[PDB]
XYZ file of C-alpha atoms in Angstrom:
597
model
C -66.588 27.819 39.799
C -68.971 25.643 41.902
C -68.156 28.448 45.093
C -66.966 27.132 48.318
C -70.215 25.060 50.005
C -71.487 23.840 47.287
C -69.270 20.980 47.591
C -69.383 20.736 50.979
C -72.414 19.731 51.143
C -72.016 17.303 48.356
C -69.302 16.499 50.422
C -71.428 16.236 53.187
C -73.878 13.734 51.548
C -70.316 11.436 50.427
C -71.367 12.082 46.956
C -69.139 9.491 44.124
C -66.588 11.850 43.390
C -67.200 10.545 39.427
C -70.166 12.777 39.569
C -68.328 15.741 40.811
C -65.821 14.992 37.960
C -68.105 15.182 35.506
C -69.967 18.690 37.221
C -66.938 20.503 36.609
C -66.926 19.935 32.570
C -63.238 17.651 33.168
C -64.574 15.430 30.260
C -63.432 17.491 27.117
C -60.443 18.981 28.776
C -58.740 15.986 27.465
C -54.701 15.024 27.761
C -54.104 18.755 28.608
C -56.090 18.708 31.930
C -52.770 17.874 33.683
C -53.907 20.917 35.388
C -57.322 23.110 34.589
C -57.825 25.244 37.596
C -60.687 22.760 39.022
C -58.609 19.770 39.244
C -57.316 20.718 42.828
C -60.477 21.261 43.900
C -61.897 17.883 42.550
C -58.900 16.123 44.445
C -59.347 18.535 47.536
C -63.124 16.793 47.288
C -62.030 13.440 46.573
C -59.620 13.742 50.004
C -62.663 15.241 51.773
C -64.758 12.021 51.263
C -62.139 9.734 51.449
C -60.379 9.020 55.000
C -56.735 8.433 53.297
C -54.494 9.846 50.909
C -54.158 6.123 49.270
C -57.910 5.673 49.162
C -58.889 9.719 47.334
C -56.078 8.704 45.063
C -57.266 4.912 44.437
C -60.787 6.644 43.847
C -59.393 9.411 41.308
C -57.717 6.572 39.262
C -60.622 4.652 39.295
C -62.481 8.013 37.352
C -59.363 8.058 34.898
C -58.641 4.967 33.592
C -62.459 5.202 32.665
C -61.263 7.916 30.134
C -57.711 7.492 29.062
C -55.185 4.317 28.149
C -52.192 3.230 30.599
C -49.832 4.707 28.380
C -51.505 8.093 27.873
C -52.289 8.734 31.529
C -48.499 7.989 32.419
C -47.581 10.345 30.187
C -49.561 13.114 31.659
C -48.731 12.141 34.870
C -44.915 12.256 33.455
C -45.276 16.003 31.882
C -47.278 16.566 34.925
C -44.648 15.658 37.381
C -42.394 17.788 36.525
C -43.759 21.448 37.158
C -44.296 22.614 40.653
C -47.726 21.978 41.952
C -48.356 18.886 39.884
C -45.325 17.197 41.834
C -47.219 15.471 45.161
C -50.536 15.163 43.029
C -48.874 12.722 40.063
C -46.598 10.924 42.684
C -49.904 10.152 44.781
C -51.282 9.062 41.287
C -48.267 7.426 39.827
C -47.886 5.311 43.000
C -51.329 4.233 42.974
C -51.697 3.512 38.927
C -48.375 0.785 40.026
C -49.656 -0.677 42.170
C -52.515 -1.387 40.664
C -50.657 -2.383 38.075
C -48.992 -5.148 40.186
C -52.310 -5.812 41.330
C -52.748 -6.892 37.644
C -49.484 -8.671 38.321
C -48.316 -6.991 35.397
C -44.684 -7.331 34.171
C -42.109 -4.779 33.474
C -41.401 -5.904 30.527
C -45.538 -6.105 29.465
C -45.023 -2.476 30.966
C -42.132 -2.155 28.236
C -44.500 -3.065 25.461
C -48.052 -1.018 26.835
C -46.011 2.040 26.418
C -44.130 2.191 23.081
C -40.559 1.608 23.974
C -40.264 -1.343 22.038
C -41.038 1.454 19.017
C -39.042 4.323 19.967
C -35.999 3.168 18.486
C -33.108 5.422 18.924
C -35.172 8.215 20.536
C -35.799 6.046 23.249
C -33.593 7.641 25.726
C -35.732 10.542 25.521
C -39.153 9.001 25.629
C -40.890 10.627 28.689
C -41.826 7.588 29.965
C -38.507 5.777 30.725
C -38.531 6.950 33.829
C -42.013 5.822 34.936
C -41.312 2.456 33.729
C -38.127 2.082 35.574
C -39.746 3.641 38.700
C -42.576 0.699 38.040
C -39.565 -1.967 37.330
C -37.604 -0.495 41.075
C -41.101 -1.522 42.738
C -41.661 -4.311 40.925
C -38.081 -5.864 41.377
C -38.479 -4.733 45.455
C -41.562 -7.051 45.207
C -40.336 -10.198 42.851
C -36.961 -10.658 44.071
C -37.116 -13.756 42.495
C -37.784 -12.344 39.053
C -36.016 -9.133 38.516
C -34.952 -7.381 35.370
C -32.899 -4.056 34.158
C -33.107 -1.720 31.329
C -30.130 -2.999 29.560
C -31.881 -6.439 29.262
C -35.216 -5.785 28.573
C -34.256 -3.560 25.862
C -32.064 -6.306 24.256
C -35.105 -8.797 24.534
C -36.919 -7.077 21.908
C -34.507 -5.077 19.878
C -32.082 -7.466 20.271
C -27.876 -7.073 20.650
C -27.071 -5.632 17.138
C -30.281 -3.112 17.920
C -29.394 -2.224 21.041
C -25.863 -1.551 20.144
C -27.269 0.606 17.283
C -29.420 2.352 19.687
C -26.493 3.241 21.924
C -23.849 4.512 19.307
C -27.369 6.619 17.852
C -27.979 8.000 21.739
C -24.062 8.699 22.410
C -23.715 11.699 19.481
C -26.293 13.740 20.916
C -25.261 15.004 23.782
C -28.337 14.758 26.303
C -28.127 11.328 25.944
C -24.710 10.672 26.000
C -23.780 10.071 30.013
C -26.904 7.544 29.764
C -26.121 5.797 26.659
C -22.403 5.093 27.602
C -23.270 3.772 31.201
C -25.673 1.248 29.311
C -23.087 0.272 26.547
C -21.027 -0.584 29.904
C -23.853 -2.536 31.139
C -24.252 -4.394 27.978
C -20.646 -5.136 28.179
C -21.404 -6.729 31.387
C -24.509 -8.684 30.613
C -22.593 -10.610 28.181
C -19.128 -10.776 30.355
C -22.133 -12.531 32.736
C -23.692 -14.789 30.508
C -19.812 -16.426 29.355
C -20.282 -15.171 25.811
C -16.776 -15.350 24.288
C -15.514 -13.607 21.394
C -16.792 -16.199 18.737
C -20.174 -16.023 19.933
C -20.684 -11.734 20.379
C -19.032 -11.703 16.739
C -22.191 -13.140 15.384
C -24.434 -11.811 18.240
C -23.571 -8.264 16.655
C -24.123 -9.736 13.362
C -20.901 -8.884 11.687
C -21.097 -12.033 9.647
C -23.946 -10.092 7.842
C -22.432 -7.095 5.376
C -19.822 -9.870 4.882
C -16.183 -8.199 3.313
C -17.452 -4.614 4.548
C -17.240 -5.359 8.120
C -14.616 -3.453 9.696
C -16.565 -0.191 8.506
C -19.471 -1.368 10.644
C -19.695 0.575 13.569
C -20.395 -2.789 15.962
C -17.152 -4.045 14.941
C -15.476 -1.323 17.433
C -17.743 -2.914 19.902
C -17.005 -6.321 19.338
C -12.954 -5.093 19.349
C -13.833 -2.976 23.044
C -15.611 -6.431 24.156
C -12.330 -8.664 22.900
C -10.659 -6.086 25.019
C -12.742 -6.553 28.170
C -12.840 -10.199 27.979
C -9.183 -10.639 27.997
C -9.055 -8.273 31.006
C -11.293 -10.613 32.505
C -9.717 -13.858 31.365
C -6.012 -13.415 31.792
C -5.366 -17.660 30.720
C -7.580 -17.238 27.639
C -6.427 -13.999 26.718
C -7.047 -14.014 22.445
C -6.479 -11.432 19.507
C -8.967 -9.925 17.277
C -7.015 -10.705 14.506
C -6.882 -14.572 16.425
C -10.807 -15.106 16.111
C -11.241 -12.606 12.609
C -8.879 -15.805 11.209
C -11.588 -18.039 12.272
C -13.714 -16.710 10.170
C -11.424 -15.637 7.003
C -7.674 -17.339 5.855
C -4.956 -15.326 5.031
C -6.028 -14.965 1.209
C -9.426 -12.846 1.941
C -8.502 -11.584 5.349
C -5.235 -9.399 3.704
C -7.258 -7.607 0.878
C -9.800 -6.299 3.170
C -7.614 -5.054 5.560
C -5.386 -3.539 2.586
C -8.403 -2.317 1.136
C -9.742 -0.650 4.627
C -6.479 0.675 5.538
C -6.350 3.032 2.563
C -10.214 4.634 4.161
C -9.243 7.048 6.208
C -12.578 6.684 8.135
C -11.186 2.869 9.426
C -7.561 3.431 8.823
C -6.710 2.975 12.491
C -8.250 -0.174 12.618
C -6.970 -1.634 9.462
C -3.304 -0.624 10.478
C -3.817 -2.381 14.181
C -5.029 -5.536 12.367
C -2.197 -5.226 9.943
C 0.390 -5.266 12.613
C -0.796 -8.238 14.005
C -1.407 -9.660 10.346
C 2.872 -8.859 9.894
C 3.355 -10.491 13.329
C 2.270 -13.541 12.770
C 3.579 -13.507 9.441
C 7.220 -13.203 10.752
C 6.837 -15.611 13.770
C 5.459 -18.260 11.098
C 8.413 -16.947 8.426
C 5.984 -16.775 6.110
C 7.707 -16.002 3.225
C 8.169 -12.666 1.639
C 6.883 -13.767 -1.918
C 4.151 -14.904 -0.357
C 3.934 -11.942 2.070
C 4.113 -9.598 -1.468
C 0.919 -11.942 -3.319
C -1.024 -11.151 -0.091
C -0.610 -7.706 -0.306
C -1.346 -7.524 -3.910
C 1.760 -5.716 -4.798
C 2.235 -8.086 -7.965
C -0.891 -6.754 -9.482
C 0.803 -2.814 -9.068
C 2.100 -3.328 -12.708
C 3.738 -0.094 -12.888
C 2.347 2.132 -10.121
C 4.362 -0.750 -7.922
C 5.888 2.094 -5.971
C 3.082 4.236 -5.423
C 1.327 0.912 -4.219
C 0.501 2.190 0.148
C 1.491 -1.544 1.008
C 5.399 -1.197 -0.847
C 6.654 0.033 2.327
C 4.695 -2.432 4.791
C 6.410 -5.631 2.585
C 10.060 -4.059 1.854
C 10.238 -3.213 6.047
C 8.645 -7.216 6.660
C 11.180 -8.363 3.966
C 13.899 -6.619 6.184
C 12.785 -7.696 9.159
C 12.732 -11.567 8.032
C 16.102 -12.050 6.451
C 17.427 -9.798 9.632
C 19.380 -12.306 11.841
C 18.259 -14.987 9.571
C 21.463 -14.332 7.750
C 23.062 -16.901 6.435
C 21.440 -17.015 2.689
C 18.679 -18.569 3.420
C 16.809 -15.524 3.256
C 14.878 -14.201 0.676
C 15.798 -10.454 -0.793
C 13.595 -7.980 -1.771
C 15.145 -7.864 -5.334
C 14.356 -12.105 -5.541
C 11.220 -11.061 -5.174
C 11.028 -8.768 -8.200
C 12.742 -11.290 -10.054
C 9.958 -14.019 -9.617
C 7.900 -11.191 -11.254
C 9.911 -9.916 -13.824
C 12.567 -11.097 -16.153
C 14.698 -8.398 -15.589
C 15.388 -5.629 -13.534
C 14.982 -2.968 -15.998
C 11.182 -2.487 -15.462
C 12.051 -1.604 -11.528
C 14.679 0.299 -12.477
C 12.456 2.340 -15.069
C 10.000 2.798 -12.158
C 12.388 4.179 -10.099
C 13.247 6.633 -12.881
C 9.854 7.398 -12.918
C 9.368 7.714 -9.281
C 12.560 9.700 -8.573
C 10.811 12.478 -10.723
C 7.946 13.326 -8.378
C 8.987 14.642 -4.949
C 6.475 12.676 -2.948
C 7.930 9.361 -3.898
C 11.935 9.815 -4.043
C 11.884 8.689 -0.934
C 10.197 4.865 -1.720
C 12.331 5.283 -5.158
C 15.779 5.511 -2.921
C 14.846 2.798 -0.711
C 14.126 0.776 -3.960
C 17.159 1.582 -5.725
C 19.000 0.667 -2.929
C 17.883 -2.967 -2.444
C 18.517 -3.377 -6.212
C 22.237 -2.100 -5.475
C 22.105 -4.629 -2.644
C 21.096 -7.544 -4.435
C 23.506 -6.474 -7.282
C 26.385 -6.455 -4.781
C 25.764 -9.697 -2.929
C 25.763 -11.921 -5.888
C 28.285 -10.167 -6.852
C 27.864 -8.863 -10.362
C 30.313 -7.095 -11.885
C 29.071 -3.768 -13.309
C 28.948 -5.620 -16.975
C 26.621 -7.904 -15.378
C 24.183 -5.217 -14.317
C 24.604 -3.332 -17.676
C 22.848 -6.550 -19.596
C 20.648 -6.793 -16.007
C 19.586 -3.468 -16.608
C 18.936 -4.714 -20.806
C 21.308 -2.138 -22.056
C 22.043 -4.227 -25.271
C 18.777 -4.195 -26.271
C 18.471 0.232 -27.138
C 21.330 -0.259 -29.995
C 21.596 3.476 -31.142
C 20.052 5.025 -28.112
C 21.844 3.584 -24.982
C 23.743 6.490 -24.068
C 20.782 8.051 -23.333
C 18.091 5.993 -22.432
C 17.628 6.969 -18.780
C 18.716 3.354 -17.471
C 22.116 4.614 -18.166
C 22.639 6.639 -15.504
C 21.506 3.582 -13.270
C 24.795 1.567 -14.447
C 26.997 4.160 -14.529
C 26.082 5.019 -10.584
C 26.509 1.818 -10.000
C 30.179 1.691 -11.592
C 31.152 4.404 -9.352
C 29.775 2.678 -6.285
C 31.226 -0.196 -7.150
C 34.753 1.002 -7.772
C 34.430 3.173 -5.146
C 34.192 -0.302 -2.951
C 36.773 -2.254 -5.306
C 40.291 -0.988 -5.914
C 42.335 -3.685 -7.809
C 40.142 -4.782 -10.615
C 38.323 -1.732 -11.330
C 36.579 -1.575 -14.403
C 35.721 1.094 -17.148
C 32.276 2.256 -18.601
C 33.206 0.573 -21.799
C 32.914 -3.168 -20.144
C 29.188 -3.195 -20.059
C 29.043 -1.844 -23.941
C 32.156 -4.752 -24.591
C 29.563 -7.183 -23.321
C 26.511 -6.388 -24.833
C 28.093 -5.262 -28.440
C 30.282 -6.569 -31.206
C 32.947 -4.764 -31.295
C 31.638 -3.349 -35.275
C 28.317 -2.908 -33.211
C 29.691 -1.221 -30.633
C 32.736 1.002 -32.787
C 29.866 2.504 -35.241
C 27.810 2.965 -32.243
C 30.603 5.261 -31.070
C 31.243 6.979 -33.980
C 27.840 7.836 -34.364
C 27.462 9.035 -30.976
C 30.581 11.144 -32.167
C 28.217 13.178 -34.461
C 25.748 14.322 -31.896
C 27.157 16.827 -30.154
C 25.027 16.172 -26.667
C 27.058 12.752 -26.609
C 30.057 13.279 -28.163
C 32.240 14.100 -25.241
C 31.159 10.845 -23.651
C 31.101 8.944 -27.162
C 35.109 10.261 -27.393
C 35.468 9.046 -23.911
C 34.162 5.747 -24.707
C 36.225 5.505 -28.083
C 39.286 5.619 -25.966
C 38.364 3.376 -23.193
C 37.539 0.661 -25.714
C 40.779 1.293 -26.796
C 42.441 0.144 -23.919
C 39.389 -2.523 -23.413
C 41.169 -4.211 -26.488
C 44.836 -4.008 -25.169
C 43.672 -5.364 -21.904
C 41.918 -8.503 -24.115
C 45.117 -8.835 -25.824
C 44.018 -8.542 -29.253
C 45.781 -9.341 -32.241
C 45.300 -6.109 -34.984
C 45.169 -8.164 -37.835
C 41.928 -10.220 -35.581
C 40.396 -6.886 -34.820
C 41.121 -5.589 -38.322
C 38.643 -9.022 -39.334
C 36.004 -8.273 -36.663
C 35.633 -4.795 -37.855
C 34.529 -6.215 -41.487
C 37.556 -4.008 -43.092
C 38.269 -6.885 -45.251
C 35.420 -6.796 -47.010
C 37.113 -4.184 -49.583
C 39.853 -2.149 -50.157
C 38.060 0.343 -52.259
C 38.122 4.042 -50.358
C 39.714 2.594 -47.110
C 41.730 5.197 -45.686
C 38.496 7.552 -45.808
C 36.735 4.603 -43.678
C 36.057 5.935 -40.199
C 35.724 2.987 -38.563
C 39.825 1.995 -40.345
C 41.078 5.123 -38.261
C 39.163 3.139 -35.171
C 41.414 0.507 -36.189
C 44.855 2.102 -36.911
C 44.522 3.869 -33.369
C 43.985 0.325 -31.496
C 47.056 -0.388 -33.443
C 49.558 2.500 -32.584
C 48.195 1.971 -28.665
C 49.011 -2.015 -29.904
C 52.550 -1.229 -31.140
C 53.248 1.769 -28.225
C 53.387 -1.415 -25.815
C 56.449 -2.788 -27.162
C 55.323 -6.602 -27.290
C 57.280 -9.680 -29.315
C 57.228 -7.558 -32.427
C 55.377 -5.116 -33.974
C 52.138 -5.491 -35.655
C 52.915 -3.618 -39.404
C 49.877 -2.687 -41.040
C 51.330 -3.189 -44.309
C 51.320 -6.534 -43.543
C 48.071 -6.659 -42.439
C 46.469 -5.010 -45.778
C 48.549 -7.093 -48.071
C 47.219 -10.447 -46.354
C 43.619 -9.266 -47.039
C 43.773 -7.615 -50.663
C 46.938 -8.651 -51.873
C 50.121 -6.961 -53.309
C 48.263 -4.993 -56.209
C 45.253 -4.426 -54.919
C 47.083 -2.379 -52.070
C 49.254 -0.374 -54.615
C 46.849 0.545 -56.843
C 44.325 1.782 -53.887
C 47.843 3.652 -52.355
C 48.497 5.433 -56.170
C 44.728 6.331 -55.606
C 44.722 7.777 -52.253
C 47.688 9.626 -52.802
C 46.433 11.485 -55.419
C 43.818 12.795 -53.028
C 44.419 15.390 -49.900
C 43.221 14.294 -46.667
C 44.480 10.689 -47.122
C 47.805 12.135 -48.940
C 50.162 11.485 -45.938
C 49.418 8.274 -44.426
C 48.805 6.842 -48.026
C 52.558 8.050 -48.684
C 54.209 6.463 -45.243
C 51.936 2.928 -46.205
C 53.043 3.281 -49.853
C 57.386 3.639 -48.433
C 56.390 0.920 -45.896
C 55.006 -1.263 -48.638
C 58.111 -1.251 -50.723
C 60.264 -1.228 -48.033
C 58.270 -4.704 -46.979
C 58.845 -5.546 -50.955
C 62.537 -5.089 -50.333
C 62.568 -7.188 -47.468
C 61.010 -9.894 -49.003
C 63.682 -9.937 -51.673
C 60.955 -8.572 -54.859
C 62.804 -8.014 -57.874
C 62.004 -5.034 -59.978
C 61.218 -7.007 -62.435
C 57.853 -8.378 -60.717
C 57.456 -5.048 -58.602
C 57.512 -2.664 -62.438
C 54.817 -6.198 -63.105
C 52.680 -4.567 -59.997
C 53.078 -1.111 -60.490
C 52.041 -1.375 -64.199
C 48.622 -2.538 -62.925
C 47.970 1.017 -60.577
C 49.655 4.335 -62.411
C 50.295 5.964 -65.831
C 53.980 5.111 -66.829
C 55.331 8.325 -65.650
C 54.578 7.836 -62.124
C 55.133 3.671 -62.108
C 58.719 4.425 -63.604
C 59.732 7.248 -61.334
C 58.034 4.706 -58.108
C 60.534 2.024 -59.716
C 63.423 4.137 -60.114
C 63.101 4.749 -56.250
C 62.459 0.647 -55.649
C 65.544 -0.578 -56.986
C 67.718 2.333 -55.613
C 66.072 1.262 -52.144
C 66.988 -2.365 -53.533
C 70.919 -1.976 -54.673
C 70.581 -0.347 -51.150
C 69.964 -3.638 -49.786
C 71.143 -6.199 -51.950
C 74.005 -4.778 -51.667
């Protein structure tokens, strides 16, 4: 408010424009007198008394770095610049506070530091004075040629790689940022293509050897993959993998659990799947072997959740893909595999049971089922074979329906379906795992139940013919059945009807001669033994008629063998009150006269 003259004649007597500076009350106005009314007219005074634009501006600095730090009075010439009529006034200033400051022969870098951009960390991008200190570092490279710089290197000298890296991934999700902060992860790309730093020596330059095991979740581990990337693009005759110089760094043994353990993280599940394709690769060009390949993946620690394991697929598809073309049994099979880890296939087969229950894991139960069926076929077991495989002598009672059943029986109708002149019957597997008085009272207790007595009936009958096909003498059978243990109540024994079956099937193929079962009772018990239990069991309905066709056959045998009456009324005697042993001898010796003659 000094009023138009006033100043000129203190511009007339080339009065220090500090003094006029101070007149118009400029001291308290502080870091907000980018503009205060007055402040043109103090430069329109400072031009009057200087001859030059350079020289009123070299004067005005001269008053303000007096008052306020390098880094403050950038700033305000920074906020300054930007609105309209503070544009030509802070470019006048700006201009003249740089050159100065080369004057001071000041670096860019010491630049860097007297403002805070060293500090700013991730905000740095938006710092309003980044762009006064790369208009100072354009003048200052124009006038050092020999000692230039750029932003991308300064801010790795004090951050450092790993920092600035940090810095950039920070600056890239906002979205002012963003154009700047990918142009400068480009530059840092090419800084280090410039310097010859390979892969080996960015991997520690990022610092992924620190955090160890977790390393593929850091987020400078995409940048060291990007940089692999651009190197090999570069290098064409040195072109190497990531998973090439990760193996420098960690064998086979660590390297496969992390990258099993990453791939199931969604957040680096790409990554982890890339690697593991390589991982596979390798595998397969080394043959590597597919035990081996299932330890790495640390499927034999699955116990039972083997088949909801995420790396069952992976190693059944490298198993297939070694041992494809490789054939000629030197392979090595999926279910070999299994068998180094368990004794017996029954445990896979109970997890595909398992597994064929849920609907999200049929599909890895079908595709394991299938390679047992496979390995089952190609070694060529016989169905009997995969019943004591699949330990089906070991549930006694309960076979028939323990849920491994099913398993042999499919695989007796795929199988037969593939074999057409020695096809065999559900009973062999039973035949081989039972006794034959194991496996009849087995039977005949699965007769009682009516859920398995179809089946059990079945299976009666089929053993039947299991026993003709064997060839087996009655009297042999009779022996393993334990039937000669007593007489006492035989005809009422269940399995002795098991037994006198097998022998009208025996008889109904007419062989040499005919097995008699007379014969065969009279060996174990002797003569009076068998009368007196035939008296008894006559005398008794439900074993009345076949005790009364084994009671004719058993004289009619006496006959044969030429028995006189004398020593048959001696038997008879020993089994019956005296009315029926002399009417059972009045029919012996008229069947006798008969005969002889």
């Amino acid at each position: 408010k000094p009023g138009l003259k006033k100043l000129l004649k203190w511009a007339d007597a080339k009065k220090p424009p500090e003094t006029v500076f101070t007149r118009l009350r400029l001291d308290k106005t502080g870091t907000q007198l980018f503009d205060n009314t007055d402040f043109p007219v103090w430069a329109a005074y400072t031009r009057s008394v200087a001859q030059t634009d350079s020289e009123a501006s070299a004067v005005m600095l001269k008053t303000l770095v007096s008052r306020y730090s390098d880094e403050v009075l950038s700033g305000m010439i920074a906020a300054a610049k930007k609105s309209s009529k503070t544009e030509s006034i802070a470019t006048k200033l700006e201009t003249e506070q740089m050159r100065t400051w080369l004057a001071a022969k000041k670096t860019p870098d010491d630049m860097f530091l007297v403002f805070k951009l060293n500090k700013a960390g991730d905000d740095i991008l938006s710092s309003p004075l980044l762009s006064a200190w790369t208009n100072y570092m354009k003048l200052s490279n124009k006038e050092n040629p020999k000692a230039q710089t750029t932003l991308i290197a300064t801010m790795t000298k004090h951050y450092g790689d790993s920092g600035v890296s940090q810095i950039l991934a920070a600056a890239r999700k906002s979205p002012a940022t963003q154009s700047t902060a990918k142009r400068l992860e480009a530059e840092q790309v090419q800084l280090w293509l410039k310097k010859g730093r390979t892969p080996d020596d960015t991997f520690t330059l990022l610092s992924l050897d620190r955090a160890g095991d977790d390393l593929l979740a850091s987020p400078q581990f995409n940048t060291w993959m990007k940089y692999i990337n651009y190197y090999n693009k570069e290098n064409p005759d040195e072109k190497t993998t990531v998973l090439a110089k990760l193996m420098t760094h960690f064998d086979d043994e660590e390297l496969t659990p992390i990258l099993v353990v990453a791939r199931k993280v969604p957040s680096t599940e790409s990554t982890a799947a890339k690697l593991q394709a390589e991982q596979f690769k390798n595998w397969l060009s080394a043959d590597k072997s597919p035990e081996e390949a299932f330890t790495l993946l640390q499927l034999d620690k699955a116990g039972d959740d083997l088949l909801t394991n995420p790396q069952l697929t992976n190693w059944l598809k490298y198993t297939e893909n070694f041992n494809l073309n490789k054939e000629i049994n030197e392979q090595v099979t999926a279910i070999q595999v299994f068998r180094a880890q368990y004794v017996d296939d029954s445990r896979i087969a109970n997890m595909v049971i398992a597994a064929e229950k849920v609907p999200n894991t049929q599909a890895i139960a079908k595709r394991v089922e299938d390679e047992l069926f496979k390995g089952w076929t190609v070694v060529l077991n016989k169905p009997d074979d995969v019943f004591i495989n699949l330990k089906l002598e070991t549930v006694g009672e309960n076979v028939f329906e323990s849920p491994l059943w099913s398993f042999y029986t499919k695989f007796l109708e795929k199988y037969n379906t593939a074999n057409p002149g020695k096809e065999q019957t559900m009973i062999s597997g039973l035949a081989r795992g039972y006794n034959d008085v194991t496996l009849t009272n087995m039977l005949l207790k699965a007769k009682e139940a009516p859920s398995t007595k179809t089946l059990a009936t079945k299976l009666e009958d089929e053993l039947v013919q299991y026993w003709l096909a064997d060839k087996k003498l009655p009297d042999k059978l009779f022996g393993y059945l334990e039937l000669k243990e007593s007489v006492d109540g035989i005809l009422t024994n269940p399995v002795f009807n098991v037994w006198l079956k097998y022998l009208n099937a025996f008889n109904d193929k007419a062989p040499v001669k005919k097995a008699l079962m007379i014969d065969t009772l009279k060996s174990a018990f002797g003569d009076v033994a068998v009368s007196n239990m035939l008296f008894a069991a006559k005398k008794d309905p439900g074993t009345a008629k076949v005790a009364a066709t084994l009671q004719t056959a058993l004289l009619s045998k006496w006959v044969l063998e030429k028995k006189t009456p004398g020593q048959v009324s001696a038997i008879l005697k020993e089994g019956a009150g005296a009315d029926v042993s002399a009417k059972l001898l009045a029919t012996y010796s008229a069947k006798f006269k008969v005969r002889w003659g």
